[model samples]
Target: SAINCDPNTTTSHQLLFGFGSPIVQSVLFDGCMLDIEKDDYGFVWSCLSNENGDYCKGLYKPRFTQGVSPNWPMCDLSGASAERCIYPYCPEGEECVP
Candidate 1:
């Protein structure tokens, strides 16, 4: 279940959800490996690195054969294109689109 692979944690299958634990607890304890959840404007609620330097942690957009931005360029902005982007899995603190 946990995404830790290779040098991180092999055969390990779960990452602990952190709340009041930081510094006191984080992966490499080999206990708490963080899988982040960024937002639309890109903010880090659960990031292990300095994202974007502005500290903004954004989800990378999909591309051709998958999809494009929520507002697909040159698509007339109709259909689902007018709506928010869809993710393979929704990030935790980010707003879930309808």
Candidate 2:
């Protein structure tokens, strides 16, 4: 059986599905955490800290692996090389600074 980690309840597990490439999602993190999600365009969706609680668009690409954790998988992007940058540039009235 597969486990669907709920974004509302699960604080650790990353959301497995989003708007982007299903292959990327399957290859990347297993689930979503916080407000981050992979859109259909292959861009990663993450919320800015300044928004208080709003989704901030962004992108993430796996660079390289640093090390592996015994409890976790052999390939973990969270360690390092995971690039995160703002995107779409929130319009006025929308918080973008972070």
Candidate 3:
């Protein structure tokens, strides 16, 4: 299937991945995909995003993925769009709650 790259979806991706680089959210790859700017040919789809800015990351709204943390991470974005919450799987005795 083709990518669902549009204003709404792209904005959703940005909101979901936090403010990284909107220049790279024209598509959403499931698990493995690489930057197309450098490798526009898709020759090496290794999903190598450890570079300067080559990828997108999941949203950490609370700014807290795990451990004791807090923030308006859940600010504007609703729980409906939330993919998952780390608080639910936090370490024992941590009292994780999203």
Candidate 4:
């Protein structure tokens, strides 16, 4: 199952995961998968982030992937993208929701 990132999907705030990057943060709000940058690559990826800009140090957006089994570490673009949230680690050969 794909995670819903559309803010317009509902009225209340949901705990959906979103990418963390300066570019992404500037363009999209929290819980948003779409951005003004018009890139869809961030749709399937999830990463760790914080008040500091460590999650997406030098990249336009956090490293994104289509699955979770192999890339549960999600945010690997920078050392700054460290542990700030409860990262969902997928089990071995687990079926990715995407």
lDDT of each: 0.26, 0.31, 0.27, 0.32
TM-score of each: 0.16, 0.19, 0.15, 0.20
Backbone clashes (count) for model 2:
9
Against the true structure, candidate 3 reaches a TM-score of 0.15
Native-structure RMSD, model 2:
13.9
**Candidate order by lDDT, highest to lowest?**
4, 2, 3, 1
Q: What is the per-residue lDDT of model 1 for residues 1-98, given as tens digits with 9 covering 90 to 100?
A: 23232333323222222222221111221222223333485423332323532111222211112212232222111132211222222345677443
lDDT of 4 by residue, 48-89 (tens): 556863333212222233222222234323333333232333
Counted clashes in each candidate structure = 1, 9, 2, 0
lDDT by residue (tens digit), candidate 3, 15-97: 22333323222122332121222235532222224456443343211111223332212211222323222122234456745
Q: Residue 47's C-alpha lDDT in candidate 1?
A: 24
User: Which residues of candidate 3, in runs, are more than 4 Å off?
Assistant: 1-78, 83-87
lDDT value for candidate 4? Answer: 0.32
TM-score of candidate 1 on Cα atoms, chains taken together: 0.16
Candidate number with greatest TM-score: 4
Q: Whose TM-score is higher: candidate 3's or candidate 4's? A: 4
Please identify model 1 stretches exceeding 4 Å from their true place. 1-30, 45-98
